[PDB]
Amino acid sequence: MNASRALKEASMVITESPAALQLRYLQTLTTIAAEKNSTIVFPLPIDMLQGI
Amino acid sequence: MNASRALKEASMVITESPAALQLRYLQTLTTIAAEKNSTIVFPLPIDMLQ
Amino acid sequence: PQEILTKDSVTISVDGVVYYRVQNATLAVANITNADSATRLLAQTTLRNVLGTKNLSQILSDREEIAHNMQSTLDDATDAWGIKVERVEIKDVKLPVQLQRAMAAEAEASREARAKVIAAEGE
Amino acid sequence: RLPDSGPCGWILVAFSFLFTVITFPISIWMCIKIIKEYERAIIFRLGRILQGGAKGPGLFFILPCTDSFIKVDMRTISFDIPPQEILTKDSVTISVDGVVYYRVQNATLAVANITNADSATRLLAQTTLRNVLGTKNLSQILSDREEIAHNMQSTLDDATDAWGIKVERVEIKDVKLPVQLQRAMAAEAEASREARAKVIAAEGEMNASRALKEASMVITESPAALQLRYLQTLTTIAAEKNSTIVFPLPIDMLQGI
Amino acid sequence: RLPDSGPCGWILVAFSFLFTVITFPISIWMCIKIIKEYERAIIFRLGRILQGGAKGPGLFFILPCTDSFIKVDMRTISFDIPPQEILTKDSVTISVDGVVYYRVQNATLAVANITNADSATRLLAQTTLRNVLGTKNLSQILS
Ligand code: NA
Ligand code: NA
Known part of the structure; x- marks a missing residue:
């Protein structure tokens, strides 16, 4: 409950240019x-999968 | 039962803007x-622009 | 040291101390074979029993009540030996290693709650 | 305040007077006792205690046959308590390393009412420290020294009074968490540095963005260039x-099924 | 201020004088004391401390049969404290390695009011450092 207000403020800025969330994801x-x-990472070419 | 009231208050604020809950997931x-x-398996959807 | 079970069934080991004195020298010699050894074993069993009637949280909070309970048991037994037990105290308390982080949950949670507020401000 | 615990006498005393005088140049050294300003003496003669308080500083005479003599230092003494295992009110396992300072307040009780004043006092300090910290949360233990000291003093005074002892201080010189709890409990400090790191990282994204846009606009004019970047x-x-795992994937073969 | 802690005198002192004079070529080296500017002495005559404060620099005479002599260095001392395990206010585990500097400022109390002044002081430094750093966040400790 205490943390929720700041997350809302952050979200309202981030949604105005939604690709910002992917930048947060990569960090x-x-x-x-x-x-x-151990970390396992899968680069996934979605436009290649979209073709089949 | 004791914890539920605070979770409801937190939920009501979080759902007013869509990205907020996703930030909680990543944290x-x-x-x-x-x-x-703790093994983590991490997809990276990438677009090669075809 | 002794191995003990609390009322809520927690395994703990405790390390006690006892204080006592002779108050009737005639009984201490002629009514018991070894007054000191008898007294020290009685202290251990009395401590074992009382802590089994208490939850772990009560053991930490209720020194005065626990002392009052023990004294009645000790006085009834030691009168015939000419002995008065003055104190039984606990020097150390330990949980098994497998229980330690689980039982610490409240302290871990309180610091985690403050961390979240700091992290949200970072976002 | 006494502790809670004849004709033939003159014969023994007279025999002792005679014997010491008969042995004077040797035995007078045993008869003579000197007690310093900061010391006190408890003296028994034929088992009875000499009337009054403990004997003060100066020169005193005793007969080693009929008399027994105990000398008490009245100065403050400090002892380094062995480390202890403790549980906080919020059930945290910690080990603490204490120190106690104490002083003899009444020499008669310290001699005649307790078998070993030092060991009794040192054990009592340990158990009192164990109890008080069990009533406090870990955060309170770090913040509430004055309150903790006040709580201990009243407990110690009630017990040590009958022994003629005054405890002056109990303090902690080390506190440790077990290794399994150390990073978890540090969450607040770790979070503060990460929060500042995130702001620095976002400024880096902003500064780098213009060059990536310029690179992108060139690359998009012949989009197969991005696949060349992918392969590099x-x-x-x-x-x-x-470890790297690579899957050559014949998509036109998959397109057929 | 003082610490919180006759015929037989004359006779015993007189005996000591005679003994030391009879042993004069041996007694010279035991009965005479010299005190430097940066030292003080605490002297007991038949268990009673000599009147006034601690005896200052100079030449002094001690009857070893009746008298006890303690000299105190008044200069600054430094001691390398052994390492300690500490918890900060934000609950970070750190180990610190301290140093303390101290000196005697009243030689009478240092002898007659405490059993071992140096040991008492060094332990007190450790506990004081332990407490104060527990009231500070790690960032405040550095700043
Ligand atoms: Na200690
Ligand atoms: Na040091």
């Missing part, structure tokens, strides 16, 4: 990769 | 990654 | 010391 991946754990 | 993932023996 | 990325990744 999350960089943070996770640094931890001492 | 959870960052919290998970610090625990031992 | 794969070559870079394969050179790292990590």
Whole structure:
């Protein structure tokens, strides 16, 4: 409950240029990769899959 | 039962803007990654513009 | 040290101390074979029993009540030996390693709640 | 305040007077006792305690046959308590490393009412510290020294009074969490630095964006250029010391089924 | 201020004088004391401290049979504290390695009011450092 207001404020800015959320997504991946754990990553060419 | 009221208040604020809940998801993932023996499988949808 | 079970069935090991004195030298010699050994074993069993009637949270909060309970048991037993037990106290308490992080959940959660507010401000 | 715990005497005393005088140049050294300003003496003669309080500083005479003599230091003493295992009110496992300061307040009780004043006092300090910290949350333990000290003092005074002891301080020199809890409990500090890092990272995205747009506008004029960039990325990744799995995928063969 | 802690005198002192004079070529080296500017002495005569404050620099005479002599260095001392494990206000585990500087400012109290002044001081420094850093966030500790 205490954290919710700031997340709403952040969301209202981010949605005005929605690709910003993908930038946040990619920075999350960089943070996770640094931890001492196994990470498996799948680059996925969706327009190639859209063809079949 | 005791926790439900606060979750409702948090939910009502979060759902007023669409990206907010997604930010909560990504922060959870960052919290998970610090625990031992936590494998994360991560898709990267990419467009080659054909 | 002793191995103990609480009322809520938590396994804990405790490390006690006892204080006592002779108050009737005639009974201490002629009514019991070894007054010191008898007293020290009685202290252990009395501590074992009382803590089994308490939840772990009560053990941390109810020193005065626990002391009052033990004294009645000790006085009834030690009168015939010419002994007065003055205190039984606990020096250490330990959880098994497998239980330690699980039981600490409230403290972990409180710091995690403050972290979330900081992180949301970052976003 | 006394502790809670004849004709033939003159014969023994006289025998002792005679014997010491008969042995004077040797035995007078045993008879003579000197007590310093900061010391006190408890003296028994034929088992009875000499009347009044503990004997003060100065020169004193005793007979080693009939008399027994105990000398008490009245100065403050400090002891380094062995480390302890403790549970907080919020059930956190911590180990603490204490120190206690204490002083003899009444020399008669310290001698004649307790078998070993030091060990009794040192054990009592440990159990009192164990109890008080069990009534506090971990955050309170770090913030509430004055309240914690006040709580302990009243407990200690009620017990040590009968022993003639005054405890002056109990303090902690180390506190440790077990290794499994250390990163979890540090969440608030870790989050603050990550929050500042995120702002720095977003400024980096903004600064780099213009050049990526310029690169994109050239690349899109012959879109197969992006596939060339894709293949050079794969070559870079394969050179790292990590596992790579590659799937050649004949899409026109899949298009047939 | 003082610490919170006759015929037989004359006779015993007189005996000591005679003994030391009879042993004069041996006694010279034990009965005479010299105190530097940066030192003070605490002297007990038959268990009673000599009147006034601690004895200053100079030449002094001690009857070893009746008298006890303690000299105190008044200069600054530095000590390398062993490392400690600490928790910050934000609950970060850190280990710190400290140093303390101190000096005696009243030689009478240092001798007669505490059993071991140095050990008491060094332990007190450790606990004081432990407490204060527990009231500070890690960023405040650095700044
Ligand atoms: Na200690
Ligand atoms: Na040091």
